[PDB]
Amino acid sequence: GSMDITRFKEDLKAHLEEKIIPFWQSLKDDEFGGYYGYMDFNLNIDRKAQKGCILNSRILWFFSACYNVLKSEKCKEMAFHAFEFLKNKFWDKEYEGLFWSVSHKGVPVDVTKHVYVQAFGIYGLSEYYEASGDEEALHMAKRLFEILETKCKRENGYTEQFERNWQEKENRFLSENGVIASKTMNTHLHVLESYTNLYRLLKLDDVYEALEWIVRLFVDKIYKKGTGHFKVFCDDNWNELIKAVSYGHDIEASWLLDQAAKYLKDEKLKEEVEKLALEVAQITLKEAFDGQSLINEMIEDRIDRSKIWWVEAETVVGFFNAYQKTKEEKYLDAAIKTWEFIKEHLVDRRKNSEWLWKVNEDLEAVNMPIVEQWKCPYHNGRMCLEIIKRVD
Numbered sequence: 001g002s003m004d005i006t007r008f009k010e011d012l013k014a015h016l017e018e019k020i021i022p023f024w025q026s027l028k029d030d031e032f033g034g035y036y037g038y039m040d041f042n043l044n045i046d047r048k049a050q051k052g053c054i055l056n057s058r059i060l061w062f063f064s065a066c067y068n069v070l071k072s073e074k075c076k077e078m079a080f081h082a083f084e085f086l087k088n089k090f091w092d093k094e095y096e097g098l099f100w101s102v103s104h105k106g107v108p109v110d111v112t113k114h115v116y117v118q119a120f121g122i123y124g125l126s127e128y129y130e131a132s133g134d135e136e137a138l139h140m141a142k143r144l145f146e147i148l149e150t151k152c153k154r155e156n157g158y159t160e161q162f163e164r165n166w167q168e169k170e171n172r173f174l175s176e177n178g179v180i181a182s183k184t185m186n187t188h189l190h191v192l193e194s195y196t197n198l199y200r201l202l203k204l205d206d207v208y209e210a211l212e213w214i215v216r217l218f219v220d221k222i223y224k225k226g227t228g229h230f231k232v233f234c235d236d237n238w239n240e241l242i243k244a245v246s247y248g249h250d251i252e253a254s255w256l257l258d259q260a261a262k263y264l265k266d267e268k269l270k271e272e273v274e275k276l277a278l279e280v281a282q283i284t285l286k287e288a289f290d291g292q293s294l295i296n297e298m299i300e301d302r303i304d305r306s307k308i309w310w311v312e313a314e315t316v317v318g319f320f321n322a323y324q325k326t327k328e329e330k331y332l333d334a335a336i337k338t339w340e341f342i343k344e345h346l347v348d349r350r351k352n353s354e355w356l357w358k359v360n361e362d363l364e365a366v367n368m369p370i371v372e373q374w375k376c377p378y379h380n381g382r383m384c385l386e387i388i389k390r391v392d
Contacts, residue, residue, distance in 0.1 A: 012387045013388050016384035017070070019354065020377060020384065021066060021072070024062065028081060029104070034082065035051070035055070036051075036104070037050055037104060037371070038369060039371035043350065043352055051085075051101065051102050053100055053117050055375075056124075057082075059377060059378075060124035060128055061128075062382070063082060064076075066381070068130055076132065087140070090121075096143060097147055098118055098121045099113075099164075113162040114160060114162070115159075116187045119187070120190060121141070122145060125141035126202075127197060141198060149206075156237060157183055157221070157238070159182075160172075160183070175242055177242075179241055181234060181241055182234065182236040183233075183237075184233055191214055192260060195214060195260075196256070196259060196263065211263065228283025228284060230253055232244045232246050232297075242300065244300070247298075248310060248315070250284055251294065251318035253277075254280040255281075257276065258277040258321055258325070261273040277322075285330065289315070292340075293307050307345065309357055312346060313379040313380045316339050317386045319334045345359050346358075354370055357369065357372075
């Protein structure tokens, strides 16, 4: 460690406690349960917004994680609130697993079953089990795992979308030209993430084997060897639909794979994964870090240089992780620079706000919501919690 690293940690801990935690506490829906589903750019909450399951599971994970790391009793209470809504409204009592979305009152809006949603369920429920000891949370997380492995898994990865009763259907995620992507890196990344958390807490052999399997899938099929980049949207055989790179997903995968590797019982695979993770960090730094922050994506030869909140959050963690593994100061410098960028350009200066969704390539704010089904406390909250955990 160092003086700079110690002060970096102290800065992030203060930010988490003084900005992020109180903001998300204010989204608690005491009328119908869970958390309100939308807040616009002008900081207006739409209490009647539909509630996404992934957003609720991310809030569940976040408050549970805050308790597990900081021991805030209030955060545990906020986690309980999210857990109640998951159990009561998002959990399908008849066919099991988690609905895609419900109304603000909890009425099912979209009852289809997506692997992306089930994975975040496992991630949040396992974290909540650690926080609370609630065996019901454990049971649901285990059942989600069993359903993914026995109903959704195929030889080359997971089929990603199902009817409510687990009959498979075509996926819902589309390429930029509107073609359905049957295999997506993002869905499979969050399976990996959730299985790592589940194994961390349960050490069960079935879970271990599935963790190793999805890690191997990333090494053998999803990673583009030597390039530092993963495939993004693919057909059913992991052939790319478009030449595309998502730099935020790359750098997130780098440290999530490195994290999974710590549990691997195969030393040869562990060595390969650690090498892969470092290659991704090195190339991300070289290609996508512009001196102050990370750009977003490149589709064919078209580069999006917008600065997106979650991309910058994952960059801080991914580069700090690379520093820890290599002791190369360039990664530390990039991590702290990216945080200073976030502080100056993405942390909302208005009262009663949090982080902006994005600024454009000229660092101008763009009208986007502060809270939405896809904008959560998980990426930025986890950035803070990871540094707090990692710095002694």
